[PDB]
Amino acid sequence: SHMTIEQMVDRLLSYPERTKMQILAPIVSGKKGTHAKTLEDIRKQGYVRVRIDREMRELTGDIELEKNKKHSIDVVVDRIIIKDGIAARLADSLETALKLADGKVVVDVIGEGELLFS
């Protein structure tokens, strides 16, 4: 239910060394609208990479979404590899994503599936 950051970090640390992961903030899930204001704020906050409708796209690419169609937008906060000393970085990146997406974070494990924490 309500995981601590320690619990989240320790779960990711249970993966083998060299495991690649992307830490995502699921800011919009299955919602209609252009989401122009959202994309603007995230660009203004200095983020680079987003996943919009399952396409990895860059911010400041002039992104326009159809208003009357549902969209999902994930901010790609970090792209990490499990290795010695990553603990603090995992914590920080997880925290950043949780703040962005109002207490949810998605971890995409490359070669495996996704983990949802909250």
Partner: protein, 94 residues
């Protein structure tokens, strides 16, 4: 004492962080002030001590620098793209 950065340079993100602290930059995720840096996952932004300089945005992919840009930190606007940059210490007293 200078921290040299270039595209394709093999360096861990936290290694860059340590080196910045070593030269009197403070981590400040809550301020835009000169002589500090902020961290956003695999992006590190450095606000140089020098007046008239732009914020430097360093983008990592694994243990490699993939892109370095001059940016407006307040607005996120990209002002330039760089191959090579160098960060000197935040003070002349080291």
């Amino acid at each position: 004492l200078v921290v040299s950065l270039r595209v394709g340079m093999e360096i861990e993100r936290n290694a860059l962080l340590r080196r910045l602290v070593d030269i009197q930059y403070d981590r400040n995720d809550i301020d835009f002030r000169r002589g500090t840096f902020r961290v956003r996952g695999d992006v590190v932004e450095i606000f140089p001590a020098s007046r008239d300089e732009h914020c430097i945005r360093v983008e990592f992919f694994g243990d490699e620098i993939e892109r370095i840009r001059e940016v407006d930190a307040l607005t996120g606007e990209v002002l330039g793209e760089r191959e090579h940059v160098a960060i000197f210490p935040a003070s002349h007293f080291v």
